[model samples]
Target: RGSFVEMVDNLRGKSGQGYYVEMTVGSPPQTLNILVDTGSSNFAVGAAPHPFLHRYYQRQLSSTYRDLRKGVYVPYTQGKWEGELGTDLVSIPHGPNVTVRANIAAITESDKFFINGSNWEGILGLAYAEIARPDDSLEPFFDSLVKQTHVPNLFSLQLCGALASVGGSMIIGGIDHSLYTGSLWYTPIRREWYYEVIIVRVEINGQDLKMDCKEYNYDKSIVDSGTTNLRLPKKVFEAAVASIKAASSTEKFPDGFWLGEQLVCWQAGTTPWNIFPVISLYLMGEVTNQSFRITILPQQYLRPVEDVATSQDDCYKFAISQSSTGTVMGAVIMEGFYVVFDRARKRIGFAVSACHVHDEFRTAAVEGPFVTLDMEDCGYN
Candidate 1:
């Protein structure tokens, strides 16, 4: 079968908290917007009405909704949900014209999972089944779709960083060359649970952090779409902050700004990009003595806050944060490239995104041939 290209919607405008696509579930075809999350493996939706949700998937209304009679509880970094496992006919309206029986989680209760102004009602997890709830035996949505439709076992993502834009596109079954440009640099997936990879090192405006290569990949490193910020280990985050401070001419940024607790506004129609440094991450390549670098300009890390009411100024916030769970290349990095998840080959590919344009100039950069010497096994088990 041919590939399916689904249009994605960005919620929270400039913040880009989540990206979702419309899907029809069950026999009667109840339409809902599902968040595209690669960090997890459960296809979950709101089943019971809540203060934040306007509608839910009524299982009784769908003749093809089969109850699995199993309780499932999924927890995330910021939220948790309790639900029931079931099966239903799922179809993506904007995707390939195919219907497949998929495991669905009818979320009956949740805490902090649904935000107040989110347009998406459910989550479409596109990861391996190793992290699936209940058990690995329960196939994930993408796996079921690929197996049932006989399509290629790969998908690609393009996330456009803009204020209240159409978001981007998720190409299922194959890569869409038009969404990206140039050749894609490949990186081996270190683990199956997440799109785990090894970080050889990090650089700030061409200046290396100079730490041990393993320090960048201390616990684990992953490329996750569900996350909104570029999260680094506490030590790494501190070093990065110090580097940024030393590299930039602006010296008195509030302490809260570094903590991601406050918004820093600049004069209207002006930006602080010139005051920031370009950040880059070097990833282990598919072969020895090789590495690939993906770099994000200041425009990517200094996120614009569109909702600010100031007429004379524009607000921006720091998008990088410290994490205990390990380094995460989230939207801050993903927005700069067209990422391809080639599970069939157990490697991830990245290219310069077509939508990564700023004022007629490309904002992101990707380069290769960086030496990988002495950077062996830079990942944790």
Candidate 2:
């Protein structure tokens, strides 16, 4: 039951801000840039004013900006916006930059489902809608591309957000030969980008962790790129911290662990817990395990104290969170082997272990986040 996931490189610094898609068009083609937000689904760049720049972006596209206070609808923990879904002359850049005319969006009014710091113009919805609604997850944008490009299966993403320089890319249409280790391990996709599975066991220091998903929580596995770390459920998080603590037998620091409002405090590695275990996700026949630590991650951002509150925890919210919705194959599993996410085959695959294979990785791997990006070219700007 070793399940592994390939990390999709982030697309932050690429072409201003927007991901490419496949499409078949019956009209003229145009080139445009859109934001790639895994936290959001539904492709919506600056539909009207064309160039959208806000708290985090600066743009200058003078076009007829329309207000959709009555059309599109979305709900979020943040703000929501009105949208106008339409198929237009969309074109991609490849082989003279094949630009296929396709369907895109034009959003108008918005509420609280979006982050204030990001300059994203609009959004794309991919989450499952209720009983009688239509599914609009940039599906038309992708299907049209398949028809025009004729690329087998749908396109894929290889976003690298960890790198500090250069632009991160997304491999649409198909994977470019230069990005992979040749061949891939795949599993049946569960319709959504994330596949549902059973995690047989978890081991720390080769000792099986005593927590099971069946009794404690529900559906603890998911595949994603927008998230930064593997946010465990309260119970699992506690057990993991305790296991690492027991293994290290180190003295604790007062601020070693931190939880916001709910579990305001947790037991974490304050004095740097080593001798950590190989936290493995058993899916299919592959197993990936990696060392992890809290706080000391490779990168963080600057959000003002007045604007967003200031606490080591608040300032570094991206470093940690309370997310057990999905069992991510973050840098936790990627550093060990090449992860293959095969939607066509509907299967995921993994190579042999890298952490254990390299003899030097014995204890040195503990300092980094088990979570990492595919390629850092897609840094958090």
Candidate 3:
């Protein structure tokens, strides 16, 4: 009664850009930056031992460490971050409310891609399984919360993109229209968060853009809203570039080119990004009156490395199979769309809208930092 009567105590910290959250791991409770990611499925943080930038965190914090069979899964080559998958306990301010017995890991080191002293420790993704699971994972996280609970399969995110007066919110319950200001455009949720979208047409800035059926062999993409870029299979990407090339006839960017930061994206005095990306998400759905406008960093502007890296990259390396054609979607276009997850109707929806993230009150995210916390001294803030 007391727990429900009172609000749950959360450990909201003061970071550079804004406030941030910390999640506990291990029996002794290893403290790591817990982000609210609508991108990741199985909650994972870098356990690699790196500099504990946060003055509030300490190894003396209540936490125990046991070595596991070395499982090397590095986050980025540019960074010294290291890791291993193990189980642990997590405590929260409202008591040890969330006990996570997960394959938790920590960042041992880092050269690049570390939290830039903002409030964020790492990514805390809150996306649908259609984007994360059925591929990267469909772990016990969902099962842990809903095995017997009549709670809706749907989870809602109330992004606090406003001023610091409102710290922002992420609610994991049924739909509460008190936040969004639009009618629900429901689309059926299939195997995961991605529902089969029946598109009659796709346009950008009121200009119709059709897919080259011959070149666009891949079909079906998970409608992801977590990413900041739109990614597609290599061939489909080539097709789009070809169409752009046919219209623009730009000499710097060749037709059907796979440009990372190499052929495109001039970083001024830095890397010369000479390529111009002609890409857009032409949506063909029920909510046709929405808008799609974006400032994108094309994947071609990437470092241009063909060699695949584990758990890293602008585009995902889809499962290699004969049955599946290369297809994927990124967050760039999804950002402008109002996404809805309706488990009651077994549907998901999207519309053209804008997210109002307050810059002052909001802090940037921390990525892959290491912490073996001492619960006794700094147990759940």
Candidate 4:
């Protein structure tokens, strides 16, 4: 089956947030920009007018809308919301021509979930049904579309950096070879709930951290497009930062910088990228005895603080944060590669993104098929 590509808008230019796509929901089609989140499984839209939202889905206006009269509440790491469950016709104007009857949560109330100045009026979760709110019986939007259209049960993403003028593309149903370079490396998806994977090791500037490989994984590990940072479990986060400090020429970074509470700035014509080292993550390969590595350059982790930058000085902030839950390979790493969520095959594919271009230096690298000697179980249940 053929694939459908939807161009997305990166909200980083406005609030340094996630990417979004225009979706048509309800009969007579109420169009809204829906944030494409791989971490969540709920298809929720702003129903009541909020101070942060410019528009919301008016259920009464849609003749085909049906209220399920079920209360749905989803709590995220940063925010939470309570809503009413409903059903309606949903379609992507630039995606598959087919429309799907999907379960939708009309978000009537929320807190810190919808950021101020955000353009997206809703969120479209792209993960599997295992984590669907209320229960797995409620099909996710993408699953409903794939079932109705008979497309391949896969989707691909290419986030062209937060500063790219053209944003990026989300390909549904099949892989788009043109958007990625080199051969795609495959890694088994250990769990279906959150695109969970096993991280075998982590390195700074090609040198292993020398910690127990299991420390890299901690409780769990996942690839999430909704999250903005490369979150590491506390142990791994501290080790990574210490390694960076030891390897860098600069002996000091403010305590606030490490905590993501302050920004570091330099003269407008200069950059601090050269002072930092590259970071790499080793993921279990398709063959259990082997592994593959994905590397991101300094430019990926030292994100520019665009809103705080001045004509005289440019500011930057650390993109990696400490996670209480598990290691999250979020936008900081995902933006460097073209990621394929191959649900049907029970694996994820990664390749150098065609859009990851920096005139001064390479932004990302994928290398591996290396053999592994250790045989410990690396997967989390």
Q: Which stretches of candidate 2 lie over 4 Å from their true place?
A: 1-10, 13-32, 37-41, 48-70, 94-97, 112-140, 161-167, 176-183, 191-198, 213-217, 248-251, 255-278, 285-320, 324-340, 349-381
Query: Candidate 4: which stretches are off by over 4 Å?
Result: 1-15, 163-166, 309-312, 357-359
| Each prediction's TM-score versus the true structure | 0.94, 0.60, 0.52, 0.94
lDDT of 2 by residue, 4-42 (tens): 122234334321123322222223332333444433345
Least well predicted 10-residue stretch by lDDT in candidate 3? 372-381
What lDDT score goes with residue 373 in model 3?
27
What's model 2's TM-score? 0.60
Q: Which scores greater on TM-score, model 2 or model 3?
A: 2
List candidate 1 segments past 4 Å from native: 1-14, 309-312, 357-362
Once model 1 is optimally superposed onto the true structure by TM-score, how far is the C-alpha of residue 274 displaced, in angstroms? Answer: 1.4
Q: Could you tell me the lDDT of residue 261 within candidate 1?
A: 94
RMSD of each: 2.2, 10.2, 13.9, 2.2
List lDDT for all candidates, in order: 0.84, 0.38, 0.38, 0.83
Indicate the residue-level lDDT of 319 in model 3: 16
Give the candidates in order of TM-score, highest first: 1, 4, 2, 3
lDDT of 1 by residue, 1-381 (tens): 323334332222225658877789997999888888888899999999888886789999999999999999877767799999999999988777789999999999999998777777888888889989978998999999988987788888888877454478887777777788777999999889878888998999889998877778879898998898999988899999999989985657888998999999888887746778889999899888899999898777888787766545788889999999899899889989999999999999999998874543436878997887865767765
Angstrom error of the Cα, residue 311, model 1: value is: 7.4
Model 4 Cα lDDT, one tens digit per residue, 1-381: 333434332222232667887888898999898888998889999999898997899999998999898998888767899999999998877665678899999999999999887778899999889999989988898888878887678888888774323367788777777788887898888878888888888899888988787777778889998888999999889999888888884757788998799888888867757678889998999885899999998777887776753444778888899998899988888888999999999899999988874547556888888887572565544
Candidate 1, run of 10 with poorest lDDT = 5-14
Q: Candidate 2 local accuracy as lDDT?
A: 0.38
